[PDB]
């Protein structure tokens, strides 16, 4: 698993938690979005 | 109730709902206190 990479690969094979993780992932996506708004506020008062 | 203030006083007098409004207003003064020190932390940092 942690020489060849194939950790990711595995969870990539199996259906269910294909979804699992892609859904946990594009949440992902979206809250660091977010993230870099809330900061950029924070840098500039106004 | 309104010309005597007499609606507080009314409220005090059953235990059980005075218990729960008594309840309700300490969580009040704990959360204006919060939220001056979230103003105070944003104040300091951004």
Request: charged share 40%; hydrophobic share 35%; glycine share 10%.
């Amino acid at each position: 698993m942690h020489a060849g990479g194939g950790l990711e690969k595995f969870a990539r094979e199996d259906p269910k938690v294909r979804r699992h993780l892609d859904l946990i992932r594009r949440k992902e996506l979206l809250e660091t979005v977010l993230g870099k708004i809330e900061e950029l506020h924070r840098i500039s008062s106004g």
